[PDB]
Amino acid sequence: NLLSDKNVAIIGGGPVGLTMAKLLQQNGIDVSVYERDNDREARIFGGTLDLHKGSGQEAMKKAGLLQTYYDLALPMGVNIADEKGNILSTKNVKPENRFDNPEINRNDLRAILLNSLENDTVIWDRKLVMLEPGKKKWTLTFENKPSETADLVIIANGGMSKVRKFVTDTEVEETGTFNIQADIHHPEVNCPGFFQLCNGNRLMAAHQGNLLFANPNNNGALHFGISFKTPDEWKQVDFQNRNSVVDFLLKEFSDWDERYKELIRVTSSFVGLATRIFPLGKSWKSKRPLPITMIGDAAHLMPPFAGQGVNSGLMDALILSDNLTNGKFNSIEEAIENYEQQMFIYGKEAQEESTQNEIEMFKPDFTFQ
Ligand SMILES: Cc1cc2c(cc1C)N(C[C@H](O)[C@H](O)[C@H](O)COP(=O)(O)OP(=O)(O)OC[C@H]1O[C@@H](n3cnc4c(N)ncnc43)[C@H](O)[C@@H]1O)c1[nH]c(=O)[nH]c(=O)c1N2
């Protein structure tokens, strides 16, 4: 068949790359994942992920992992609040919808996927820096580690990938929004008023161009994110200096309730990130020297504010893995072309929705109401 006596290199062990590896490996394909992280115990900073019926859940179902996801995920409702702490809307999880998109911790999702792979599928401390096409095989160059070869390379190393040029000359762009994220440990003790306002639900609030998103129970930690249009002055806050970030945020949140200000004051450290997009437009390069493609945020990074992100990437893994293993294609290149053509349609729809949603939500008069 297409991959008999051939091997596949996946670049990046995020949720998308590890899913791609499981879907190929369960079909008897020789596949390795190269992951820059030093070891499997690396904590992944970030909020939870939720898998959707028909995309992320379909990939887990094909892998035999859907029940494992359900068992480690948490169905969560959503509260909409104003800047004064008034709950404007409470949507609790109804038992009939409890399988719709339960929330999973990113380390828990990585553990499910790693435990599903054969020993030594993931090669840790392997930061890909360059590719070179040979006669039949790619040579992979890693930072300060020996080279490897593969018949097929799948780029899955996230939105800021610098190994995309064999596929496309498209560049990542800033969208003009900015995100500050943090975790609070023991939130029932350290931000009790804000914790009680969430009342076991996710919470969202918007006032004068500032958005706040919180999850009060990411494996017992509260995760929150504040998003706004990137200030022109920054076209001036040191994210290593918590006192500088606190000062900036308390000026921005000056007319919000003290339950929100308490969140800012008690946070031990903050992470800042400009919103970026890897825009799908014109098709990627045709006639590449050897078989290569991209999946996940490497293919279609987009703003996350409407819940686009990992589900598009898991759909990529499901489509590409099916094309490589279903025996219908005459070549790996044709299997790749078919996946890319499909991904350009659902990916452009997702990016269009994400970008329109970002425009609407950052108008200075928006409220989730
Ligand atoms: C603030 C915020 C909030 C959200 C989200 C993003 C952001 C920024 N997302 C998006 C979601 O997190 C995203 O789509 C997925 O993490 C993409 O998974 P990937 O595996 O493609 O990349 P991901 O970035 O997760 O993984 C890439 C992997 O490759 C590795 N790597 C990088 N460079 C490498 C190199 N050169 N060599 C080897 N390995 C390398 C990295 O270490 C990492 O393990 C989201 N999505 C969603 O569905 N729901 C949500 O609620 C949110 N929320």
Residue numbers in the entry: 12 to 246, 250 to 383
Give me lines lifted from the publication on this model.
Recently, several plasmid-encoded variants of the tetracycline-degrading enzyme Tet(X), such as Tet(X4) which confers high-level tigecycline resistance, were found to be produced by MDR bacteria isolated from animals and humans. These novel enzymes degrade tetracyclines more effectively than Tet(X). In this study, we characterized the mechanism underlying the degradation of tigecycline by Tet(X4), resolved the crystal structure of the Tet(X4) and tigecycline-Tet(X4) complex, and revealed the substrate basis of Tet(X4)-mediated catalysis.
The monomer includes 369 amino acids of Tet(X4) (Asn247, Gln248, and Thr249 were not modeled), namely, Asn12 to Gln383. In the Tet(X4) and Tet(X4)-tigecycline structures, FAD is bound non-covalently to an IN-conformation such as those of Tet(X) and Tet(X7). The FAD-binding residues (Val27, Glu46, Arg47, Gly57, Gly58, Arg117, Leu139, Asp311, Pro318, and Val324) are conserved in Tet(X2) and Tet(X4). Superimposition of the structure of Tet(X4) and structure of Tet(X2) revealed the difference between the substrate-binding domain of the two enzymes. First, α10 and α11 in the Tet(X4) structure were shorter when compared to Tet(X2), indicating that the loop between α10 and α11 was extended to allow accommodation of a more flexible conformation. The loop has been considered the substrate-binding site; hence, an extended loop might enhance the chance by which tigecycline attaches to FAD for oxidization. In addition, a number of alpha helixes in Tet(X4), namely α6, α7, α8, and α9, have collapsed to generate more loops for substrate binding. α4 formed an alpha helix structure in the Tet(X2) structure, but it was deconstructed as a loop in Tet(X4) structure. As the main components of the substrate-binding domain, β12 and β16 in Tet(X4) have also become smaller in size, forming a larger number of loops when compared to Tet(X2). These structural alterations allowed the secondary structure of Tet(X4) to adopt more loops and turns, rendering the structure of the substrate-binding domain more flexible and more readily to accommodate the tetracycline molecule, resulting in increased catalytic efficiency of enzyme on tigecycline.
